[PDB]
Design a protein around this nucleic acid. Sequence first.
DNA 1: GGGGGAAGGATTC
DNA 2: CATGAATCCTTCCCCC
Length: 341
Amino acid sequence: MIVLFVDFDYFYAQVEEVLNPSLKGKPVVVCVFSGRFEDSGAVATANYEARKFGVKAGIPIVEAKKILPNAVYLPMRKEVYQQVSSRIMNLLREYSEKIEIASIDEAYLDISDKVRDYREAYNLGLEIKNKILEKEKITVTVGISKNKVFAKIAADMAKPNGIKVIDDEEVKRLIRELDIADVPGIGNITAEKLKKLGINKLVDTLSIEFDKLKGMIGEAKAKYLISLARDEYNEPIRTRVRKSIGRIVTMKRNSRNLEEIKPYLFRAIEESYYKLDKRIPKAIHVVAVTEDLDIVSRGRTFPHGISKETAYSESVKLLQKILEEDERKIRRIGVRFSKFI
DNA sequence: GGGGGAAGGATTC
DNA sequence: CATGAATCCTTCCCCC
Ligand SMILES: Nc1ncnc2c1ncn2[C@H]1CC[C@@H](COP(=O)(O)OP(=O)(O)OP(=O)(O)O)O1
Ligand SMILES: [Ca+2]
Ligand SMILES: [Ca+2]
Ligand SMILES: [Ca+2]
């Protein structure tokens, strides 16, 4: 079992560098402008020139400008990046029949049968890196190891524009030295619950009862961390299928007025249906971000598919339910369609 | 008791 | 100052 994980470097900004080469060398910041006020919004991603100074995804646009008032700030263009992403995704296929597209910029390849080992795999790595670089002018980092989890950790260590392998030998070392937090699927919330338990390393999960681990971080997470530590993690490369489609927007200002919120809600629905393109959902959820950044949601599943007319009237009821069951204002309103026929 | 689903939230990338 | 989606978790609930 050999897995080759491909991760496109600072993807959104790099695509902007490609569509306009004169941006190379300068700090590029791709952000999302919320409408709320002068430069309100967050940074979606930035190139490394910008990351050297603390400007990264997540921080407010207003914060990035204080640090880098002369960097190039560009509005995110998701559609463009998706098409470029797809074209790259179609190149990888040719290197493997078993391909799992994790996200718009990550993918896992089952190259167990394309090679026989870690020399031909590494070589297959460069083979792909160059193919992509020449065809799309995009640099990507490649990680290679026995399973998906370590493959990804390989790229995490290699990026940007790198390629690294983690032989069964080094896997044994990491399962003992690697900060559990750096393990995919382990965010801050989980990384902490693990420290209070004394688990600062993958192996440490072996020195604890499974029942306390289940109790603290959940069964699914417990078995995951344990198998990995036991060095028996072996998840296959599957074809992820879209289970849901939605869209959430930010309002000009918070509010609890149905008539002031509807337009944004309807706009979110219109876009969601456009993206459904032929897909018919039987379930609908209205999602709302409260003034204090809380996420509330009310939904409903129908025994039949949902028409735009139904979604329209139903979303208003779920929005009214939200308001009747939560005093806070709404900062962002949206919808999500699931359970496709 | 326990299957099976639905609803609302928790987490992560 | 704060911008799509999968998976998992907990709580119900209907029911044989
Ligand atoms: N805060 C965000 N807002 C919008 N899109 C985001 C955000 N964070 C990440 N993404 C998207 C765009 C890039 C993609 C990559 O996943 P991830 O952030 O986990 O790896 P990464 O940090 O290597 O990505 P990259 O460097 O290309 O931006 O996910
Ligand atoms: Ca990535
Ligand atoms: Ca990336
Ligand atoms: Ca982490």
